[PDB]
Amino acid sequence: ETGRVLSIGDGIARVHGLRNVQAEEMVEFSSGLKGMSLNLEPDNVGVVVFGNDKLIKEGDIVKRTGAIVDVPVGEELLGRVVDALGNAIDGKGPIGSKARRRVGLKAPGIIPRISVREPMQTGIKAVDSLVPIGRGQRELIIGDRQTGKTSIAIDTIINQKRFNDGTDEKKKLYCIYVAIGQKRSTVAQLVKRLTDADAMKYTIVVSATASDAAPLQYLAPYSGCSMGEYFRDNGKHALIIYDDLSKQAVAYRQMSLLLRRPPGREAYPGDVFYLHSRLLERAAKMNDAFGGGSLTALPVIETQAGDVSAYIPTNVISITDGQIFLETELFYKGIRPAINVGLSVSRVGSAAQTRAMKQVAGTMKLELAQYREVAAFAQFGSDLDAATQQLLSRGVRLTELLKQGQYSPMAIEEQVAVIYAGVRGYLDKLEPSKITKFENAFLSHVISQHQALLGKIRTDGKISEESDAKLKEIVTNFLAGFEA
Amino acid sequence: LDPVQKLFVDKIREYRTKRQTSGGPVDAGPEYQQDLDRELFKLKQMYGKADMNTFPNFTFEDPKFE
Amino acid sequence: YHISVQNMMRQKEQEHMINWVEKRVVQSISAQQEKETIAKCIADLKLLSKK
Amino acid sequence: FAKLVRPPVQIYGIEGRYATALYSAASKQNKLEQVEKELLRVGQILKEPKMAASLLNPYVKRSVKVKSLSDMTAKEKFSPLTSNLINLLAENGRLTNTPAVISAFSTMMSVHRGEVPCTVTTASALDETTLTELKTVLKSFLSKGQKYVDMSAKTKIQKLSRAMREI
Amino acid sequence: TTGRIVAVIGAVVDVQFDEGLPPILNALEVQGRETRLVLEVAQHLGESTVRTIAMDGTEGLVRGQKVLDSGAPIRIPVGPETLGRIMNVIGEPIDERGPIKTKQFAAIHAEAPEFVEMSVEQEILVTGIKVVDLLAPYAKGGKIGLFGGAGVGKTVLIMELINNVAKAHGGYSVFAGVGERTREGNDLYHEMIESGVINLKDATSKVALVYGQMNEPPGARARVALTGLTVAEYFRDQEGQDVLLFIDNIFRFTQAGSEVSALLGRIPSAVGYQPTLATDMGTMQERITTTKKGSITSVQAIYVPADDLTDPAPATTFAHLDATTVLSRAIAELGIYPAVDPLDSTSRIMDPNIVGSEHYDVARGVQKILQDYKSLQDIIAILGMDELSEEDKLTVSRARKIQRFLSQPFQVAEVFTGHLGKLVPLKETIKGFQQILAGEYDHLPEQAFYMVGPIEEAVAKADKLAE
Amino acid sequence: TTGRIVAVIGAVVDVQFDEGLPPILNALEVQGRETRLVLEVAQHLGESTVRTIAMDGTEGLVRGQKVLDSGAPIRIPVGPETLGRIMNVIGEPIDERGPIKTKQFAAIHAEAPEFVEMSVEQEILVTGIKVVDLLAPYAKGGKIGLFGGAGVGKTVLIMELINNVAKAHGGYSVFAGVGERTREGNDLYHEMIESGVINLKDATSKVALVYGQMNEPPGARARVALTGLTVAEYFRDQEGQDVLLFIDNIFRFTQAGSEVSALLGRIPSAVGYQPTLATDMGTMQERITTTKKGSITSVQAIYVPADDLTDPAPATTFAHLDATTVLSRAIAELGIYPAVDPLDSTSRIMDPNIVGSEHYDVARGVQKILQDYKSLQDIIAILGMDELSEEDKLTVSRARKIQRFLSQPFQVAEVFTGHLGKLVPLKETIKGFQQILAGEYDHLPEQAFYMVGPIEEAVAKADKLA
């Protein structure tokens, strides 16, 4: 049924036997420890141990499972917290895992799919206007440590309350959250954050951390994928967040090096691209003939001193359908969430907004990449013609708009509200140092007064000359009532 | 599946002579007690050190200011 | 508090309780030479079934 | 060029590469057995108190070590087409290796003959048959005639288990 | 004959053969799979064993599994019945439409068009994209390359290329997505069925699709491009036809080659590419060519790893081109799409004796003034603008105009831009710039040239921005 | 049983057991020297040989030489009979005060606190150090990291913290010196006997000392980080107590790793480090934590090689902290002590809901003007102050004061500063800056804010000059 252990060290067990073992097939150990075959060589199987290899000793017994590696799936996982193999670890006794999907699934080819059309809202003004995500998209969050990379992915799940506590069965989005490499002290503090704001209910949270074995971080984001593959392959909407792929890669490197696979750039192994490529392809927008179901994926990357030449950060950017950059510089400068518009792209553009947003911000992304350059050219105090005197006279106010609090998403309707304020030029005459006490009022004033207008735009997701007309006064009915 | 359903019975011919043998946790030796005191300290920690059988009185405090 | 002063108690005891099982069964086979007959028994019922 | 009699034991992949040779060098003249015993003998012509002052001696070298192995071949019960697996290890500087080369000669011989599965507690079943676990029963008849999370893990822990009846 | 797997790591499987040692390149057959697995032979380690790359994932194989010497190199559905059909690495169709039906098959490992077959005729293929045509026109039936770091508009360009060039074309086109995004294939299929260069009904399909994306193994990606070109190599040699071969992204070929190289036994070379990055490219670019027998206009897009145009991959690619459009992040970042570097882009036919002294003299004049503006660039922005000559505030003025008039609302980019597509005929481009250059619009303000089509459409925005 | 040394190199030794074979992690015991030479199995090479990391010099060992299995990990004294005693990496005592008679023992290795045991208790821990408090406050029972290159003042800062913190602290403190200066230990010892945290007379001692310094072999430096670890662990668990764990220098742990990884036979990773830098660390690291049971406030000094904050060592470690203080040579060279980078030190509790949005507001307001100054930094260097717009001429002057008012003369380097050691309470910290920020002080010279306590000593100073 299976055989010997030739030698063991560093999570790498050589095995003399297992002669009919499948490559990539998981073995089991004497001590009851699940391992894994990865090197099928002439005279031995190198096996990556999925845990503390102290228990293993030369000579122990390794037995086949026959199975390629797999994990628990389905709604029976929501609200839980499972390790990289599906096992529960929040102390609430096993999950109801009737559904059991394989980790090593290849991604949907060409036909099973359809252009990404479905707005995946983050509730972050910055993202939802200038780099909008859509269901099936891979949008990378990349940045130096402590820039806000996570308070993105968290603020987004916490936004999905609104839709998951309602009726409309398309607007619903179940969330997985892989946590690779982090410290338990944090994974936890984070679940606590989810729980509080009440979002934990619609959210798997697979967690393979610091102390967890190496192959367990290697695998974690895959497992957490299969779990999200179900939700799409069965006509529902998933948003998985790998946080972060940087730490995962490092892990894969360890296995690979210990397995004696000759090292490449920065020591990583050759396929270190394939690793993130394949995983990240598995997020798609399935076409109707297949469920209509989706899997939006926010991978996360962490840079050193901003170096986006680093082997990895360049790989993952080449893979995802765009990205948000972070930048500590903007952060302290006041631009929280620190984003760098001009350098953030969404390779799906408006094809993933409401026609409500699109109308307030569809050519303002190529405007805050020219008002940018046209305030960096005439930085100095001189003179400039009739055309470029205004662009600046505007922007400064506009940016004060995407300045946003934390753990406080916004529903698309309200976003369109404030964005309208400026973009149509109803702020083009206000001192920026106030454009926040302003918004914080004009938006609680037009929720207490006109649940009316929101009603329409929220639903039909557009601003008819009707809706627009009402606005055109509700606004005006405010600037003159403060300054003038 | 027919020479194994009764070997799982060598496990309640003892489970029996245990959950009936009163007179103290069986054959303990010293160990049994000491440890049941260390975990009697730390479990007496997160909560406090006062009387757990009585209803606590109440000292109250004014509202500070920043 | 007592939700816990009884929690460590029902478990710990039931540790020594199910563990006590071990040492009385290692005494049952090591001793009882008539528990070396119930050895060759159940085991020869292996070769068979498998085939 | 020559085709090779790879006998379904195969063994190595890197080192006892001479061994995998003579199941193919032998299987032409069917002198498999002539050597199966020839080697057994040389395995101790070298473990003498008179042969270790070269066995592991980079002192004499490929000079008087190969033509001083025209003796421990020609002389004794050898001098066939197997006095050469020595005359190779002699030149190719791996006399210090032959024990392992004989070892594997066996484990490849007794897979054209015997089978190797072993009992639990003592010796070799040598089930030299056309069928595995056929004669595994009818040859061990000459052997007579000569549940709460934790208790789960602690029951399989004695069955086929541990340090007990192992001794 | 029959062979047995001896060992398996990641993407490299060694196999042992009783008798029939398959020649390097020979496609081998893995017996026992729920989906076909081929192993292109790669070397003879000896002792009747051969190391090989898998054209799909080796999850599942087992030491001893049955392998059969398919006797010859991978072979594909070359032929006319490939149009409208999505092929792949090994021929197998994957639009779900049951076997591709032809009785002509060719190995994807050919030799290369000898010296004497080389065609020396080059004539200007206009693309209607102003920047390319003005400063670096492509040539009918020539090797074109699209250089780009990630996200700078490489792929979008090649779309607006297949939209323009490949629609008003009555020949055959072969687009092969090597190693990039699967999303983007599905994305094109449907645009290319809306336009119906692919028609599901009749047989009027003008476009063969070969595909092997970033979700497949290194084996696949390493050879997907070898396939898609075998496909377009037929339509050339036979028809005598005008085959348009697009690749995206010819980079993934050398990268893919990289991933396995390690496991194949290679001391790595500089930047850690295969010691063979050079020739691997050679005996493969040297096939994507134009013989006397036929012509292939080729439009490759090359990833520049981290934008370093010196990275041994994009670097070695330059030798193999006749016209190179190089994309700039710094330009894109300024909103000037298509971010073509008007000073790193080059054509072989930018010769006054080929494009005329008007064209040439005008391109080079634009190139010059942009270069001069680049020169004043760190005087001015740190030491007071108006401290410039009269001559210079002038060559700045015009330059920034020229520099913006070089942008174009692309038709496949309306989704991003916000303006309706566009397309300018060569002579209205030459004229447009010749003018700006000549000092005829020094009065109209900057933004008027930003993202318009023919020069007049800027005089349009010239008043629209006014009153 | 018994086996023999068959290979020795550096701190890596290869033992052959014919009978039996020790689990990976079993402390072996060399038989033949006047000095307890523990080996520690780390690999089974097969052919019934194991590979081990020494815990001391290996001069002398011979191919031959017997070794006895201990049947267990390296195990050391734990309990209250450690407080006041200096012990080495294997538990042996080294304060020449007899043995450490103690009830129980623990092993140095140990699995780490399961997810259920974590605690999200976030309460601020004031240091009385202006920069730390105002911009990135330490958290009670939190992990704290002090990053610095050679000589920027980690050790001083850890000392000041030990003083402003562990002196008036009802609760046990453990200090692990990992591969730093032996004379720093001698220095601590005496300094803590005088001050009386250690008492030779009683068992009133409040601190345990574990030391394995930069003179001991890789193995020893490799491990000792864990010895002291285990100790703190006990005081947390079997005492549900308030533990203070100070390490200096946690870097030397990964470094020592590197020295051995070479001959253990791993293939080198980035920058030459061990393949296993992230987990080797992360196991060890995740044991240092506050659980439901006990509570450890950890403070680890982290060396940064060649000032490279991206070197894997410092680089990886960041993941593991809740508050970080980063020291820049750049700053220190301008006599701004403590050398804290205000735009690079962070805490996972700078959050209005936790520190009260007056704190969070004065913070990010300082953090802003500073990072605004920092942007002008380039034009000021090439064209000079004058080319600065009027608005900007200010943003500098104010910022430059903030820059200067974050300096604070520590009660330790009363010797280098000469100046009297101040400790500033959160209130007057938050206040003073607020004022500086609202420009009450644009009338005072820069120096006036350099090296002072509350904002009074500032305005006060400004006079003595005039």
Ligand SMILES: Nc1ncnc2c1ncn2[C@@H]1O[C@H](COP(=O)(O)OP(=O)(O)NP(=O)(O)O)[C@@H](O)[C@H]1O
């Ligand atoms: N929009 C915001 N406004 C104000 N503060 C914010 C905002 N977003 C994030 N923060 C704060 O900035 C810190 C960093 O956020 P975080 O999401 O952990 O970035 P990060 O790069 O993922 N950190 P890390 O996981 O160590 O890499 C937090 O502790 C927040 O409270």
Ligand SMILES: Nc1ncnc2c1ncn2[C@@H]1O[C@H](COP(=O)(O)OP(=O)(O)NP(=O)(O)O)[C@@H](O)[C@H]1O
């Ligand atoms: N906080 C301080 N205030 C004033 N002067 C200081 C301060 N810290 C360090 N210095 C001076 O600079 C030196 C370095 O102090 P130290 O804390 O030992 O740096 P370090 O982080 O330990 N680098 P090293 O101990 O060599 O690994 C001192 O000996 C002082 O003369």
Ligand SMILES: Nc1ncnc2c1ncn2[C@@H]1O[C@H](COP(=O)(O)OP(=O)(O)O)[C@@H](O)[C@H]1O
């Ligand atoms: N023709 C264009 N006009 C305006 N923006 C463009 C244009 N082409 C590309 N972009 C911008 O650049 C982004 C990336 O384009 P893409 O061609 O996919 O990069 P890559 O070169 O790696 O394939 C787009 O999503 C878009 O926002």
Ligand SMILES: [Mg+2]
């Ligand atoms: Mg994060």
Ligand SMILES: [Mg+2]
């Ligand atoms: Mg692309």
Ligand SMILES: [Mg+2]
């Ligand atoms: Mg120090």
